[model samples]
Target: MGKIIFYEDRNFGGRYHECMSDCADLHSYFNRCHSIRVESGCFMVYDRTNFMGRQYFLRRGEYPDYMRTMGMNDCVRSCRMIPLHHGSFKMRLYEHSDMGGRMMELMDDCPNLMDRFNMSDFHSCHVMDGHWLVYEQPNYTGRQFYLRPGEYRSYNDWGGVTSRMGSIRRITDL
Candidate 1:
């Protein structure tokens, strides 16, 4: 089971709600999500209700502030726990939305997109194995998006803030 607590105020103060499963809408339980505590498993938090909008991945840890720790915009409206998995890493990136245009298949961590893919950004992707994290900047620094085994036809499909991606890393923790 997964355990996550959302706080309405920064530094984990004020009204809060504990979540064990997917929460499609957080407005009924809390005023806003500014902090979180993930006691078990990883989680995907969305900025809009019904899991539509910018997304952020949060693993087991204490996030005194969501914007600082998760690189979110301080407005979490939905959340879903990511199940533990130990699988090979494989994914394909596309240069255009809807998986169109040039493609690059990745099997391992990539620190720099320009060096490896000869490109600066990816607009779409398909995750074939394991869970992965995509960063907006090189060396895994910047905003992160958690992707499971599925097809992301566009950066917006995954609730990404931008189409530019510079790094990717597999989630090793279960």
Candidate 2:
């Protein structure tokens, strides 16, 4: 099981709410979340209720503020715990949607897309064995997408607005 606490004010002050499972409407417990404490497990926090809007995937850690630490607004409306998994990392990145065109297979973390594969954008992907995080900018910066093992035919399929993926990292609990 996972545990997380949401604070209404920065630096984890003010009223707070705790959760161990998915919370669709954080507003029911508090107004907004400026800071949070991930006591255990990785969590995907959403800006709007019902798990819509900007997404922030946070591992076990203490975030004093969402804007500073997560590049997101100081608001968290929903959250879901990501169960730990131990599996080989494997995925295919396609230059075009529908898993077509130039493709690259990756089994390890890539800090910079262009540096490793001379690629800057990936329209589709097929995650074979592990959870992965795709970043919009180089070096895992900017907006990110938490992709579990599955087939993403397009950017929209991965909950992304653009296909400008510049970095990818595998998730592991070990």
Candidate 3:
């Protein structure tokens, strides 16, 4: 869907690797990931291998540094490309994992989960219609995680370090 280049050193130095698909393991392509240039579309870069651990949703741009840019503490060991979707966006936010407790259906962007859903965080979600971008803070701030059309039973299934989500929005860019 999109292209991403991982650099081994800071400022786009050292070895580099080019990827355009779901990469479960990237240690073989590059030992380190200090900088990256997302040439096109969007991507979900992960801290651990096989799309596990902390998640970072990135748009088309150049990332010369993740520590200062995204407040990342680890390298890019796995990555997933988000395909372009042009349609109605729909998702359900669950009060607990595995769709437990109360559920709220969303068809558009939510700037404040507390104000809309009367909750500070959601444990799991079911992205039944379109791609989504969930944030850790209100107004789309803080850390972020990508969600495609699938069943995410828990925060761990979405590769999120925690369930402290505050805001959510549908992907509107390529």
Candidate 4:
């Protein structure tokens, strides 16, 4: 009965729950909080978590070339939960981009990841709505595939403005 937090302002400030709310778990952690258009290319939201602590959670979803445009290299989205002394948990991640250069490179990097996943290197392909010619690696050259929105729905990059909210969930180990 944890809560979901939406970042409304302060670059990384957000509001979560105070005692594990059932509604926060329904959408799998994403709350239907309203978004505010603070600036171009940036959207923000703030929601309440129904957990014991009214912690603030911040979700920073990124576009393909967002960090690179800002001079960041090897930057990928990361969503993780802190490990309690005897607690265990699961996390989610996801991403998408219209950029061709680095975006295409992600397809190459997928196979190198050590995460617990069965699929590597996004296989679905499309013209990207005229973005780039979908190219396959050595094993997939002859086949035909197109990319879809969900193809990138693998994980989410999340964090919290505070410590408590950052822990995906709490556990009382036996």
Candidate 5:
């Protein structure tokens, strides 16, 4: 199970809401989320409702003001709990859209996509097992895109604006 708290003001002040499961829209709870405290498990916080737009992966920890820490806006419209997986992690990275072009299977974490695949960007992927974190920068830093078991036909399918993926990591911290 996952537990996360959203605060309206920095340093966790003002109104707050607690959630343990997927919340497509949090407007009724508050207008903005400047701080976040993830009490348990991993979560993907979205900038817009219905889990659209930019997403940031947050594990169990306290975020006094995640907006600046995550380089995100002062709003969090939705959050999704990442299901814990103990099985193997499997995924295929495609160099071009629609799973075409250069392809490779990944069963372990790739700290630097360029170092492994000789390319920093992959347009599509088919996640066969486990949840994963795709970073816009290498070494698990920068913008994060959460992926579950499914097919992402293109970069936009994962709420990404660009095809610049620098790193890949499995969500095993939960």
Candidate 6:
């Protein structure tokens, strides 16, 4: 019988290891099946890699489902981020790493974060959580823009911003 396991982040000593858990549905389905044997058609890890700054061993099919659920429609071959505690981190995923590293590293080198955020109080020096913020672009395929650090408050807030942008574009880009 085949089974599915989920691996999640586990932090220790300022680093993280792969976390895993068996899928209860898969276990129950396979364990109770009358025609299948425990030794046949086994499931296994496809490979180990870092996702969202943590290690994980994923099943071949599981990774695709994970991406699809998050509205991803294309292959995410590489990614990069500023890695600062808080900053205007912008991440653009691509099919190749040739651009990812250079672009993200440039973001890291640009020390003026408050200016990036366009904060009203630029010199206030409030600590920014850059670790995952830089990777939280609103349009990231495998991400929920609303759930990101500072994407939006809710649908109503986004609607207001969209309306404001429309007016601004008429005077600027338009």
Task: Enumerate residue pairs that collide in model 1.
Answer: none
Worst 10 residues of 4 by lDDT: 162-171
lDDT for model 3 comes to 0.80
The positional error of residue 80 in candidate 1, measured at the CA in angstroms, is 1.1
Task: Report the number of backbone clashes for model 5.
Answer: 0
Worst 10 residues of 1 by lDDT: 66-75
For TM-score, the strongest prediction is 5
Per-model TM-score versus the true fold: 0.80, 0.87, 0.84, 0.16, 0.90, 0.18
Instruction: Give per-residue CA lDDT, model 2, range 58-168, as digits (tens).
Output: 888888877766566557777767766646688888888888978899888888888887878778899887688888887887777878787888878888878888887
TM-score of 5: 0.90
RMSD to native, candidate 2: 2.0
Question: Per-residue lDDT tens digits of candidate 1, residues 42-91?
Answer: 88887878876777777788888767655555568787777765566788
Could you arrange the candidates by lDDT from highest to lowest? 5, 3, 2, 1, 4, 6
Cα error, residue 45 of model 5, in Å, equals: 0.6
- When 2 and 5 are scored with lDDT, the better candidate is 5
Q: Write the per-residue lDDT of candidate 4 for residues 1-174, one digit (tens) a residue.
A: 122233322233354222222232313443322321121111112122322121222223322222234233321122212122222221222213222212322222132222424233432222211111121232222121222222232111111111111111111121
Per-residue lDDT value at 63 in model 4: 27
Count steric clashes of candidate 4.
Answer: 25
- Alpha carbon lDDT at 111, candidate 4: 21
| Candidate 1, residue 69: lDDT | 59
Q: In the order shown, what is each candidate's alpha-carbon RMSD?
A: 2.8, 2.0, 2.3, 17.3, 1.8, 17.8
Better of 2 and 4 by lDDT: 2
- Compare candidates 3 and 5 on lDDT and give the better one: 5
Please provide, for model 6 over 1-174, each residue's C-alpha lDDT reduced to its tens digit, 9 standing for 90 to 100: 233333221111122122232222332222111111112122222111122221112222333133334333322222122111234543322112222211211223222322443321111111122322111122221111111233233223222111111000000000
Global local distance difference test of model 5: 0.81
- Rank the models by TM-score, top first: 5, 2, 3, 1, 6, 4
